[PDB]
Amino acid sequence: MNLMLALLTNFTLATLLVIIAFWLPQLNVYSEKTSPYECGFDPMGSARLPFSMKFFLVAITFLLFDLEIALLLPLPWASQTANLNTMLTMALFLIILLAVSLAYEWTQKGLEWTE
Amino acid sequence: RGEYVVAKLDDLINWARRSSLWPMTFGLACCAVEMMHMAAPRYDMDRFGVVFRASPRQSDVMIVAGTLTNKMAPALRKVYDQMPEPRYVVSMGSCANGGGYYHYSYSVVRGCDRIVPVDIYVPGCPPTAEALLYGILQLQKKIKREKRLRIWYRR
Amino acid sequence: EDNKQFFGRHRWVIYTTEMNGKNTFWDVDGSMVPPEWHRWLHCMTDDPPTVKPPTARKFIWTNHKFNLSGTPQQYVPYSTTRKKIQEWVPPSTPYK
Amino acid sequence: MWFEVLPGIAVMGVCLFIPGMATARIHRFSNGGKEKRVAHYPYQWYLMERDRRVSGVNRSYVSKGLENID
Amino acid sequence: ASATRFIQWLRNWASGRDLQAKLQLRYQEISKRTQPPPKLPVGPSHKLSNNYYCTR
Amino acid sequence: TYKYVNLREPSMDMKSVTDRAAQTLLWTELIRGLGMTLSYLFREPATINYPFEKGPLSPRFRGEHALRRYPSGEERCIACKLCEAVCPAQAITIEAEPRADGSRRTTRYDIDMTKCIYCGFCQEACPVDAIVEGPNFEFSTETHEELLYNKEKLLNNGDKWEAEIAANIQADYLYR
Amino acid sequence: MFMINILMLIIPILLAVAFLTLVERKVLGYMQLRKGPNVVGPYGLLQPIADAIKLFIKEPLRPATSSASMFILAPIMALGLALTMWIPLPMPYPLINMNLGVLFMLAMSSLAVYSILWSGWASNSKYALIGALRAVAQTISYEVTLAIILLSVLLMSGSFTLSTLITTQEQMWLILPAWPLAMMWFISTLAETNRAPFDLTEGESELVSGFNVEYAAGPFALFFMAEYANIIMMNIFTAILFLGTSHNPHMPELYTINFTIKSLLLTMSFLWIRASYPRFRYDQLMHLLWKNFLPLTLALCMWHVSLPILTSGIPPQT
Amino acid sequence: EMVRKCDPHIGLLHRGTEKLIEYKTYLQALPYFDRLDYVSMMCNEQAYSLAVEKLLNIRPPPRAQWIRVLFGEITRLLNHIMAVTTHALDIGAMTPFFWMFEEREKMFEFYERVSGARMHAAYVRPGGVHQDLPLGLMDDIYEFSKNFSLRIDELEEMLTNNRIWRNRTVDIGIVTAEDALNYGFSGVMLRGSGIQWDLRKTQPYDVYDQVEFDVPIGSRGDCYDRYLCRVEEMRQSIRIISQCLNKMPPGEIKVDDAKVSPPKRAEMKTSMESLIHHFKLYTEGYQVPPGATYTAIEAPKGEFGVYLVSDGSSRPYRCKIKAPGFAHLAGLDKMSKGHMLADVVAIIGTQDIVFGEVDR
Ligand SMILES: COC1=C(OC)C(=O)C(C/C=C(\C)CC/C=C(/C)CC/C=C(/C)CC/C=C(/C)CC/C=C(/C)CC/C=C(/C)CC/C=C(/C)CC/C=C(/C)CC/C=C(\C)CCC=C(C)C)=C(C)C1=O
Ligand SMILES: CCCCCCCCCCCCCCCCCC(=O)OC[C@H](COP(=O)(O)OCCN)OC(=O)CCCCCCCCCCCCCCCCC
Ligand code: SF4
Ligand code: SF4
Ligand code: SF4
Predict the structure, then answer these.
(1) Distance, CA G85 to ligand 1 centroid (Å)?
(2) How far, rounded to the nearest angstrom, does the alpha carbon of residue H6 sit from its chain's CA centroid?
(3) Where does this protein chiefly localize (chain G)?
């Protein structure tokens, strides 16, 4: 109940501030005022055109490494077990394989952005 | 009384606007160098609440510091148009006032006031950093005497 | 003045609260400094007007006026030459 | 001078002090002058819901000592 | 130049220099704003004889 | 004679390699950059309290224009038009005619202060010290038209700032 | 009395953010041999009040090419989520006492990124788009390093509860046993808050204003308020993580004063840094955290899993 | 964000200076030159004055040549402070801008105390200078110069060894020595690639052959070596200023030929020949013999010259201005190959571009 009421208050305050912003001030809207900004000259093309990602390979690798935090975050609880020898072995094995993945991509020029 | 209240509200918004002037980061020619020295430590325009911001959509003041040419004139009008109101224009230097040294050129606009409205004209070539700061404090006094709400109250 | 302050901050003026009928408690202006003190305040000289007064002339303004732009006292440009071509005035009596 | 920056830090510091102080004092006011009971695990929640029943007034922060056994 | 001895030590240490020796703010070591009048010299052509213009 | 700015070979002894290793791992040369900005925080700022304090100027300062008089009140300008001929911006327009007493005087003396480049060539060329650039620089206006000075406005400027103008010419005329 | 507690949190936060803008302008001013705001109010104390009123009585514009629903959703999301990251912070008593508070802040910090991506995309402007995709690169850069740096520290605390970090540092700050981790954590909060030298989503001198180039008036203020509420929060987090404060249950105010001072000093270091260094290229930020911090963080993560086991110093689960 | 092509569009500050000069006298055309490279005002005046004096076949007096070198090197400090700190401002480092622009403010007072204008002095003219230094100025220049070296040290403490600054500038915008010559580069753009060239030493003008200074030379041809060259040139300018403050000779400050330089006002009001020459030199101007010259100086931004054509009258026939930034900016497309958007921001600042001179 408390958490939900705390969230409602934060996003209600955020919403009411936006509402005041649009209804309190005096507005004078015309075409040139709302045109897209490109430093003074009309944009040459649409902003919705394709935008090449030079770090696409590193972005895919982020998906795989971002799943290691899910597997690594239980470690504080894992250290409470009575099977410490097994737990410590698999904790280090899992982190090491995460490191070998980094080493492979680094050495194979995978972290270098495409020209 | 209603006239008293609108007078005090007018003094509040007028105060807020003149105490938080945000010039657009917009300079054209030598006059922009003297505008840099007004931001330099000796004069420190930031202490008056005057802060440069690059986006025209977050600016309250346009300082036309330098020469305005026919090629650049459409760009100036565009960035002026993209300024949310209330917006004030300060014309700095002979070139931006009436063409200055290049009044009779095929490629120069004889005054920025042919392209945009102008609130304060700062003379000089260039005006000293302390002369531009006089124009900014003269603009603030102009905003201090606005009667937007009082004029509304008796429409 | 305070000569222990660094150059630029060693001279200053506390503006009057009234000048030429205008309330200046809050609305001070750089143009309110009369010319004789304008030279000392800007470090164009070391001697103040009280130690070395300006030369007296009967045409010098006795009353200093600050920047009048935006007021009814502002300056309006106009041509100071007289008319150049004089038009013919027809007779006021019918010829018939 | 630099110490003219302090007034802006003092106001900022006072604003950062209020949230912690207000929560600490509001908890005392809402739990009979004690810390709010922390229940991170079911055992602690089980004891808090037992305190409600024992209190006889449906409040878990109303303690009952040896005066309530006889 | 009005800094206390402690603040002078702190700022000298934080930068590694002796700042007080070379202050970037000017003080009474500048020239007087009133100066004695000059008497500038004249050029080589200020002569009353042997100074015809067709020779220079 | 020339010098190299970035032609140096780093030492390779174990103590120099470790020193660079400590710099890489402990950010020593970045901590040193912090120490320089900390020093400025404890210096007196260079800001002046405008308009209660003014930036220093000199007697040669080229500010607002003014037309001067002789000590008797007669105008110094005698409509020679040297200022109009030398003005780089053609900001000066002059007309003249014999005055009612037969004196060579002007009927129009306009300076378009929006064409002017405040160069001082006019006061250099004036043979009677009539047109000068004064010490005033705080004369911004709310309209363009107020910057088209005519003769009446220029004589008013001269009569207003004469006390200061005369003292500045007295301080600099031997350099001229 | 809970609603009063919420208001006694967000309202003081919005006031501290307002005067942090003043404090930054004056601290930047004196490190630049000038003063900063000193005219509007005594010593500039009314400058934030003048700026707030000015922005909220100014005209807001929706660009003709914008996607309105997302264009207006983004500023609401930014400020709504910047205030939501304070509710689990123990000062010393959290408003919301969470058993996984460290996880909660991680989750909210990843959701607050979309207030940048949707802001920049919805504006339908090239500079807003370039700014938005710099936030994708920035998040890819620090997210893995940030999470594993937290994990290494939590292996000495033993729980994800923020209030437990108070008990862990009852004898000594964690800056001593984990100074290498504190260095990387501090840099990762600079990247995570889009602060100089990692202010790339805005990048004034490159993208004019970046992801919020098209925003005006109140909507812009919400992004600015969210930005400054995050840096205070990320430094309160740092003070709790590495500069623990003693908690006397009979003097809960002494904790707050001491804890508030450290947070102010860490926040001042953000302004100190912004005045001292240039800006990384955003591809150089990726290589900083993948080729330097990640190899070290992985090694330190293994070290802190083994060190408690080999010294018999595993912290309690509860 | 990779830059595939740079297409600079200029002319947004094209004002027709070269066409307007054709309607002015040689004196009326001088203030135009303060407004081309409006960070190097007195250096632009000197290049124009050297060209007119060359066509006039006259020589400025020795004391004027020392003032022109002295204020030529104060101006180089003004330009390099503007170039380095704005270059650093665009890269994210904003603090140095404020420290050094309090040093530019003090050097503007030297401008203001010799001419009356902070920037557009119009002080250096064909024949010498306009007025003698006021008493006490050289003492104030000595005091400013005595401390300026520390100001540069503080600038270097922030940038030179900073690893973030080196990342933004090392191996960015590499230009080969062969390409630099063919693309028309000059100044630090040549010296950064290792070319040993400087007009102050190879083709000296005024009294630059009577002073001692070292020309910095780069090794990599990148933005970092050109930053080191500019910071080291500021140090050498202080070295020259010390020698100009001690070797300053006495004498007149403009050529003692009243058909070129106007007479003193005291003589103009007492002598018939002096009033006639004052009258003609301010209405018609001095006729310049027919002929065309190309005269160049080592301006702060590179080789600045004018191809001045005279037809025998008092007004120039043609005045072509060679702005060093015009050639540098033309090379922005070659130097940006293989770089990102943020690197082009660094390349623009390393070229030291001001569009008053590029566009004229
Ligand atoms: C020489 O050759 C040439 C160039 O080459 C350099 C050129 O360039 C140009 C072109 C010139 C120009 C475009 C203009 C140049 C002018 C200058 C002044 C630039 C010179 C250098 C500078 C360093 C100037 C200023 C720049 C910086 C980076 C200084 C840093 C200091 C600042 C104060 C900037 C902003 C800093 C901070 C900390 C934030 C302040 C910002 C705000 C918007 C204020 C606070 C914000 C709010 C949203 C309000 C707060 C409160 C809220 C929101 C409400 C909360 C409370 C509630 C109750 C809700 C020309 C012609 C040229 O010839
Ligand atoms: C003495 C200080 C003790 C306290 C330091 C504690 C911090 C340790 C981390 C820093 C590394 C220092 C410790 C390494 C040994 C240093 C002492 C040493 O190497 O002997 C000195 C000797 C003199 O060097 P010199 O002959 O001039 O040239 C090198 C030629 N091989 O050099 C030699 O010639 C011997 C051979 C040198 C090569 C050995 C390999 C050194 C590099 C391996 C990595 C060391 C760091 C590993 C730890 C990383 C984590 C910090
Ligand atoms: S008014 Fe003067 S300083 Fe300003 S741009 Fe024109 S010529 Fe340059
Ligand atoms: S100062 Fe120069 S531009 Fe202005 S009126 Fe005099 S001669 Fe003309
Ligand atoms: S002001 Fe002087 S130069 Fe101009 S017309 Fe009058 S007398 Fe001649």
Answers:
(1) 29
(2) 27
(3) mitochondrion
Alpha carbons A86 and A89: distance in angstroms, whole number? 5
**Angle between helix F14-26 and F28-41 (nearest 10):** 60
Residue F3 falls in which region: left (phi positive, over 0), alpha (psi -120 to 50) or beta: beta
Cα F17 to middle of ligand 2, angstroms: 9
What 3-state DSSP class applies to H208? helix
Is F47 within 8 Å of G34 when comparing Cβ atoms? yes
Q: What are phi and psi of H328, to 5 degrees?
A: -60, -50
Fold of A7-107: Methane Monooxygenase Hydroxylase; Chain G, domain 1 (1.20.58)
H320: which strand partners?
H307
**Are residues E30 and H143, on separate chains, in Cβ contact within 8 Å?**
yes
Task: Work out the end-to-end distance of chain C between its first and last CA atoms, rounded to an integer number of angstroms.
Answer: 86
Task: Give the SS3 label for residue G284.
Answer: helix
H104 Cα–ligand 3 center, Å: 18
Q: How many domains does chain D have?
A: 1
Give me the residue label for tokens 């030929």: H257
Q: H51, H103, H49, H110: which is closest to H79 by C-alpha?
A: H103
- Give this entry's resolution in angstroms: 2.5
Residue with tokens 């997210």: G143
Contact F42, E10 (CB under 8 A): yes
Distance CA B93, CA B123 (A): 5
Pocket of ligand 2 (CB under 6 A): F 13-14, 18
Give the technique used to solve this structure.
Answer: cryo-EM
The amino acid at H153? D
The C-alpha atoms of residue B63 and residue B126 are separated, in whole angstroms, by 13
Residue A80: Cβ within 10 Å count: 14
Number of CB pairs < 8 Å for B and H? 75
F79 CA → ligand 5 middle, Å: 5
The residues spanned by each domain of chain A are 7-107
Element (H, E) at B5: helix B2-19
Q: What is the pairing mode between strands H215-217 and F2-4?
A: parallel
Distance to chain G for B29, nearest Cα, Å: 19
Centroid of chain to Cα G71: 23
Contacts of D67 (CB under 8 A, 6+ apart): none
H352 phi-psi bin (left φ>0, alpha ψ -120 to 50, beta other): left
Contacts (Cβ under 8 Å, ≥6 apart) of H246:
none
Nearest chain G alpha carbon to B57: G216
Q: Tokens for F22, please give them.
A: 């400590």
- Partner-chain contact B101 H35, CB within 8 Å: yes
Chains with ≥3 CB–CB distances under 8 Å to B: A, C, F, G, H
Token code pair at residue B140: 């603030």
- CA geometry: angle at H309 spanning H308 and H310, to 5°? 120
Minimal C-alpha gap between F152 and chain H (Å): 26
Helix (H) or strand (E) holding F118: none
Q: Which atom of ligand 2 is nearest to the CA of F25?
A: 51
CB contact A54 to H (< 8 Å): yes
Paired tokens of F169: 């010419």
| Residue D3 lies in domain | 1-70
> Using CB atoms within 10 A of its CB, is residue H307 exposed (0-12), middle (13-18) or buried (19+)?
middle
Spatial CB neighbours of H124, under 8 Å, sequence gap ≥ 6: H42, H45, H46, H49, H68, H71, H130
Which two three-digit tokens encode residue G33? 């041999």
Bridge-based pairing of strands F131-133 and F65-67 is antiparallel
- Given a contact cutoff of 8 angstroms between Cβ atoms, the answer to whether F53 and G37 are in contact is no
Residue D29: list chain G partners with CB under 8 A. 1
Answer whether D33's CB lies under 8 Å from D41's CB.
Answer: no
Give E28's contacts in chain C (Cβ within 8 Å): 3
Question: Phi/psi at F92 (nearest 5 deg)?
Answer: -110, 130
Residue F162, C-beta contacts closer than 8 angstroms, at least 6 positions apart = C35, C57, C59, C60, F66, F68, F69
